[PDB]
From Swiss-Prot, chain B:
Organism: Arabidopsis thaliana
Protein's gene: NAC92
Function: Transcription activator that binds to DNA in promoters of target genes on a specific bipartite motif 5'-[ACG][CA]GT[AG](5-6n)[CT]AC[AG]-3'. Promotes lateral root development. Triggers the expression of senescence-associated genes during age-, salt- and dark-induced senescence through a regulatory network that may involve cross-talk with salt- and H(2)O(2)-dependent signaling pathways. Also regulates genes during seed germination. Positively regulates aging-induced cell death. Involved in age-related resistance (ARR) against Pseudomonas syringae pv. tomato and Hyaloperonospora arabidopsidis.
Keywords: Activator, Apoptosis, DNA-binding, Nucleus, Transcription, Transcription regulation, Ubl conjugation
Processing after translation: Ubiquitinated by NLA. Ubiquitination of NAC92 leads to its degradation by the proteasome during leaf senescence under nitrogen deficiency.
Name of the protein in its database record: NAC domain-containing protein 92
Disruption phenotype: No visible phenotype. Delayed leaf senescence and flowering. Increased tolerance to various types of oxidative stress including H(2)O(2), salicylhydroxamic acid (SHAM), N,N-diethyldithio carbamic acid (DDC) and methyl viologen (MV). Impaired age-related resistance (ARR) against Pseudomonas syringae pv. tomato and Hyaloperonospora arabidopsidis. Increased seed germination rate under saline conditions and delay of salinity-induced chlorophyll loss in leaves.
Length: 153, 148
DNA sequence: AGTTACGTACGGCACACGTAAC
DNA sequence: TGTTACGTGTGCCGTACGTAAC
């Protein structure tokens, strides 16, 4: 609907995990008007705002984390242009006294190599953890499905 | 109703241009909410735009008739400005200034501080010209009050 | 070898609070 | 004497970026 000026989608970390990522992990057909679905392994952050929904300053997008190596137990963070690089320690998301999620901060580098070129594109990847750790998940795509907030400094 | 996460989170400029400016230009104009902020305790302020942060209007009145210094004293305590103000620019044109004040309970020379923090946004960019010479002698501002 | 991730700095931002002004 | 603002200090956040590890 038309939002009065200033009314925007700025959810708290727990609102993202509880009302957005958690339902999608269970139902792959969960749909949200505020947040679309892209594969950051293919799409590039410069072209990202074109393929965005209800977003001007920040863009929210669901994504499927792909394992880099067959036995790597790591995540493919490589794109055609460059590579998303994890920076700093993760941030715990708690619902009441129960840990329900985790936030990782990633900065894009155009190098696609150890000679990465730092960019101003920063992505806040939110992932299901704690009360919803893959160990106690009913064979749903938990580790795979992750919400991502992309913005430019 | 609003889907979860959708809230009133306006930019610095959005506050001055879409809310403060019309109220200054056209007195009393929008569901934004107004409060006297005169002798009102901040914990009793919600008694709401948002339970996270409360946004309310305010009428700054001069403490001293000749002082021109604005009154920030309540029965419960005083609001103490911290650091320096922040510029609000709609392009290359300065439109507003944001002052951060931290509530200090006690109302004494050395009152005990509290976690109440208020971001006061004012129309300082066009204040000097007094485009509209309101004889009401009322300075209208908008404040983001939260206890975080 | 290439790619990712860890983890401790480091710079900016949001105040904390002494010391000056009205 | 009281009350308010000013202005650096600073502690904490948001990354930067080797160095290690997968």
């Amino acid at each position: 609907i038309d939002l009065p000026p200033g009314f925007r989608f700025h959810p708290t970390d727990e609102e993202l995990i509880t009302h957005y990522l958690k339902p999608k992990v269970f139902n792959t057909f969960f749909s949200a008007t505020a947040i679309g679905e892209v594969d950051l392994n293919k799409i590039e952050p410069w072209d990202l705002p074109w393929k965005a929904k209800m977003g001007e300053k920040e863009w929210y997008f669901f994504c499927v984390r792909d394992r880099k190596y067959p036995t790597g137990l790591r995540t493919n963070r490589a794109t055609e242009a460059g590579y998303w690089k994890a920076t700093g320690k993760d941030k715990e998301i708690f619902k009441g006294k129960s840990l329900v999620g985790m936030k990782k901060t990633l900065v894009f580098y155009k190098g696609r190599a150890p000679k990465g070129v730092k960019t101003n594109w920063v992505m806040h990847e939110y992932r299901l953890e704690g009360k919803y750790c893959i160990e106690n998940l009913p064979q749903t795509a938990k580790n795979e499905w992750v919400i991502c907030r992309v913005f430019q400094k």
